[PDB]
Amino acid sequence: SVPGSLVVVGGTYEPWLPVLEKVGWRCTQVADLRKPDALFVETGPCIGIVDLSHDEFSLNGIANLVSSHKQVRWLAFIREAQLSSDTICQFIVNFCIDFFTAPIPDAQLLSTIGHQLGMLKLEKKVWPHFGSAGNMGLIGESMPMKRLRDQIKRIGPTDVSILIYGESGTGKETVAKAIHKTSSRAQKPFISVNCRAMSEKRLESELFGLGETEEGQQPFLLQADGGTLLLNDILTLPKSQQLNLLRFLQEGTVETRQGVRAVDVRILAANSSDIEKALIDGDFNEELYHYINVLRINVPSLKERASDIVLLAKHFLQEYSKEYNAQARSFSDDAVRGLTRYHWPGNVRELMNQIKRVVLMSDTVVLDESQLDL
Amino acid sequence: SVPGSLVVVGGTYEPWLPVLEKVGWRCTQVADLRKPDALFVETGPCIGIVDLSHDEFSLNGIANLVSSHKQVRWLAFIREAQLSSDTICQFIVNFCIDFFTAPIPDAQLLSTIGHQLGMLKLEKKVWPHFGSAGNMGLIGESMPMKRLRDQIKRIGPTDVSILIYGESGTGKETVAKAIHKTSSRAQKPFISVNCRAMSEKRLESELFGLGETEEGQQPFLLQADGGTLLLNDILTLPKSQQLNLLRFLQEGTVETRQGVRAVDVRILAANSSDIEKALIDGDFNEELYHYINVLRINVPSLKERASDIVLLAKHFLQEYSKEYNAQARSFSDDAVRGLTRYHWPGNVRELMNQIKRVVLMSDTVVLDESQLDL
Numbered sequence: 001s002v003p004g005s006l007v008v009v010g011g012t013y014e015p016w017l018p019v020l021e022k023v024g025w026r027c028t029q030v031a032d033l034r035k036p037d038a039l040f041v042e043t044g045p046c047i048g049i050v051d052l053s054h055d056e057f058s059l060n061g062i063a064n065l066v067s068s069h070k071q072v073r074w075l076a077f078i079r080e081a082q083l084s085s086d087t088i089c090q091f092i093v094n095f096c097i098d099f100f101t102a103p104i105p106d107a108q109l110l111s112t113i114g115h116q117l118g119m120l121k122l123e124k125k126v127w128p129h130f131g132s133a134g135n136m137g138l139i140g141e142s143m144p145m146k147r148l149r150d151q152i153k154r155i156g157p158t159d160v161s162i163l164i165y166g167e168s169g170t171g172k173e174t175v176a177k178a179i180h181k182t183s184s185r186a187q188k189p190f191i192s193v194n195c196r197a198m199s200e201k202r203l204e205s206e207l208f209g210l211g212e213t214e215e216g217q218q219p220f221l222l223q224a225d226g227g228t229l230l231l232n233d234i235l236t237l238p239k240s241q242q243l244n245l246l247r248f249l250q251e252g253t254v255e256t257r258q259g260v261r262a263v264d265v266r267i268l269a270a271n272s273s274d275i276e277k278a279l280i281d282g283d284f285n286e287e288l289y290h291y292i293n294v295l296r297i298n299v300p301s302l303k304e305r306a307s308d309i310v311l312l313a314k315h316f317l318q319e320y321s322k323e324y325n326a327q328a329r330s331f332s333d334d335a336v337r338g339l340t341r342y343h344w345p346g347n348v349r350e351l352m353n354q355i356k357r358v359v360l361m362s363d364t365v366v367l368d369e370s371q372l373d374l
Numbered sequence: 375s376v377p378g379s380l381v382v383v384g385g386t387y388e389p390w391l392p393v394l395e396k397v398g399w400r401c402t403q404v405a406d407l408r409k410p411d412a413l414f415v416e417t418g419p420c421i422g423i424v425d426l427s428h429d430e431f432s433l434n435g436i437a438n439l440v441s442s443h444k445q446v447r448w449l450a451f452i453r454e455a456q457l458s459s460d461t462i463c464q465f466i467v468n469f470c471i472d473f474f475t476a477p478i479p480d481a482q483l484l485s486t487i488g489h490q491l492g493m494l495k496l497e498k499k500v501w502p503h504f505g506s507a508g509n510m511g512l513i514g515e516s517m518p519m520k521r522l523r524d525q526i527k528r529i530g531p532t533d534v535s536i537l538i539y540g541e542s543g544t545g546k547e548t549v550a551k552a553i554h555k556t557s558s559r560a561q562k563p564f565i566s567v568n569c570r571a572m573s574e575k576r577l578e579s580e581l582f583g584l585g586e587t588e589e590g591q592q593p594f595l596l597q598a599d600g601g602t603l604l605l606n607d608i609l610t611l612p613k614s615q616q617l618n619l620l621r622f623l624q625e626g627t628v629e630t631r632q633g634v635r636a637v638d639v640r641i642l643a644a645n646s647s648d649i650e651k652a653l654i655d656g657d658f659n660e661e662l663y664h665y666i667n668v669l670r671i672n673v674p675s676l677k678e679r680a681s682d683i684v685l686l687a688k689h690f691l692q693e694y695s696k697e698y699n700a701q702a703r704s705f706s707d708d709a710v711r712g713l714t715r716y717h718w719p720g721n722v723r724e725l726m727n728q729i730k731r732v733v734l735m736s737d738t739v740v741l742d743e744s745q746l747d748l
Contacts, residue, residue: 034624058626060640063534064668072467090500090531090558093446097471098493112489115472123466126459157461158468160437184461249434250407266434277672280518280525294437295467303660343654 001128003120004028005043006079007036008051013079015104023110025117033061040070044150045123047116048074049100052091053081059088066094069298073151075116123154138178139171139348140308144300151297156182161249161292165271166299169349172270175299176230183266189227191220200238207244208255221254225263232270234292235278242285249291267292302344309340312348316355326359330366338372376400377494379417381410382425382453390478397484407435414444419497421487422448423474426462427455437468446497449490500531500558512552513545514682518674529669530556535623537666539645540673543723546644547606549673554602559640562600569605574612581618582629595628598639608643608666609658620662675721680714686722687713690729700733704740712743 004020005028020027030036040048048070050062066076078091079100092099098112130153131146139145155162156179164172173192180186195203205212206219220229231237237245248254253262269292278284305312313331321328344350354374358367378401384391395401402417404410414422422444424436440450453474457463472486511523529536530553538546547566554564569577578584580593594603605611611619622628627636643666652658676683687705695702718724728748732741 056636059638060533060535061623061626063532064665067532067534068664068668072469075469085496088533088558089496091533092496093531095446095449095493098489111485115486119466119472122463126463154464155467157464158437159433159461161434274672276670280522280672280674281677282517282521286521290442291438294441
């Protein structure tokens with residue numbers, strides 16, 4: 001295990017660095033700001049110490065690197081000069097667990113860290129150094145995919161609501177299944193709901209509803225008891241429904257035909273909108289949002305999926321050709337760069353759909369320059 | 375010292391409860407769900423412990439309150455009945471500083487919490503900063519506007535870069551000055567740069583010397599030292615310049631003449647259009663974008679600010695008249711309705727400029743309809 005890193009140009013802070021050398025905990029020292037950003041990106045859950053003993057490196061950028069997205073995937077800690085806690089001490093808005101004095105109790109500082117080192121060690125123990133497999137990562141396997149799957153795993157088991165966002169057709173629904181597998185209630189039911197349509201009619205009938213609900217029915221919430229329910233594009237939801245949703249997340253009760261009984265469901269949500277505007281405009285509920293935004297997961301788009309683009313193609317054909325008895329089996333080296341350059345607004349689904357349409361057209365074994373433009 | 379709160383039916387949780395009582399902590403035990411939320415609201419900075427001995431607590435609801443709004447105003451702590459490879463063990467995601475066994479380790483218990491004692495006093499120190507009548511709300515008093523004031527408040531102290539956006543002439547510069555006044559660096563200077571029509575020229579001299587004579591130049595950042603630099607409508611900025619901008623967002627240094635000095639500036643930016651289009655086009659750098667989009671605040675338009683329009687008019691009349699004496703005083707209940715119907719593409723800015731001229735045109739004490747079109 002190497003999950004320990006501090007950042008400063010002052011690599012002479014011996015009053016507390018070799019104390020980890022001798023105790024057998026080692027170190028990882030950064031001097032710049034651009035470097036640890038990428039570092040903290042690839043290290044995941046770890047312990048990081050910021051030496052702000054006036055060692056010459058910003059403050060606006062400090063709070064940035066800490067909260068760029070290094071929130072849950074990093075337990076913050078800081079070192080400051082003994083006489084420096086006056087002005088912008090508000091940096092502990094990012095409650096960096098604890099600060100650091102100069103009168104080193106070369107034995108007590110470990111009590112601060114060891115209780116937080118062990119605090120971290122539990123996560124890395126039960127499943128150390130992972131970044132692949134998991135049923136072939138369900139979809140892809142690139143570099144942001146590595147980060148993704150590591151986030152998923154550590155946020156999986158936690159039966160709190162997680163906010164899934166990313167471009168449309170990125171596979172937000174796929175991820176919802178992934179965390180469910182880790183949520184230990186995998187065997188228990190799962191329901192993905194396309195909320196783009198629904199309208200106030202059917203949407204209400206699945207919690208209470210008009211005097212309709214033509215017998216049986218059994219609301220999805222009831223049917224997802226112990227399992228998992230997904231809500232794609234929750235932003236689209238009518239206000240009166242976001243209400244009924246909020247009642248459940250406090251009560252957990254639904255009105256059925258044979259009784260307004262209560263159920264246990266872990267709730268997931270999907271979004272594609274700018275959400276910040278909807279909050280302001282009041283289009284979507286704020287309190288509900290705080291019930292949802294407890295955990296956020298960043299679903300990558302066509303940012304850096306170049307290594308996935310080439311792989312995402314190979315699987316679909318293997319899954320699509322065999323399914324529809326095709327002769328096409330391989331791609332051309334021309335089509336390679338062409339697909340990588342493509343922006344894919346629909347991302348996966350588009351790359352999933354476009355490939356599907358090509359198969360039923362191509363009468364050859366290898367695909368060419370053909371109208372992949374559309 | 376008054377920081378103590380427990381949440382559970384800790385009837386038989388005596389082996390570790392009064393041991394803190396007589397040592398000085400001033401506790402307050404809750405048992406329900408809604409009550410502690412109200413409690414933690416009125417307790418402010420304190421240390422609260424959650425008993426998760428598999429009793430009666432919605433795992434989902436738990437993590438919420440932790441990060442519902444009990445962030446800086448509360449430090450989380452947890453008590454478990456010795457659980458191992460469970461979903462509950464993954465709760466460290468909620469940065470719960472340290473765990474808690476059932477067999478109390480005597481007077482060793484104190485040090486775990488004791489490390490956070492100094493962490494709590496600091497919180498309560500900078501914790502107040504209450505709004506002097508909310509500073510008159512600065513602008514308006516509706517519902518999207520209200521949520522905004524709560525939003526601008528919580529993101530204020532956070533000396534991070536924030537992407538402010540909304541329609542044109544909605545007061546993005548206004549918002550920027552608010553958080554600057556909200557930050558701990560309020561007394562520090564402030565730089566709002568309304569660029570656009572600058573041409574790739576001064577931005578150079580804004581980062582280095584352009585002559586060799588004497589001096590004759592002193593860039594904005596140094597003048598924003600400790601303070602805040604704003605760039606109204608950024609995305610339009612030429613490519614070669616966001617680079618050096620990023621350089622400051624990484625290094626924080628700038629050439630002058632009397633030294634290639636480094637400066638501490640919290641930078642904010644503004645956009646009215648959509649950086650979205652620029653990203654796909656590759657027009658705007660993505661690496662810098664993430665440095666900017668650390669926090670988003672959406673400035674509402676006429677979206678649901680119709681109820682504020684009448685106040686914005688009432689206000690401007692009161693300040694434009696007295697500025698130029700004028701005879702206009704009462705608007706009439708007729709010309710009011712007509713102003714609501716108008717779309718106001720420029721929103722505030724149009725209402726700002728237009729009202730000024732009308733006063734300078736109206737010969738009456740109470741204007742009726744008049745022109746008011748454009």
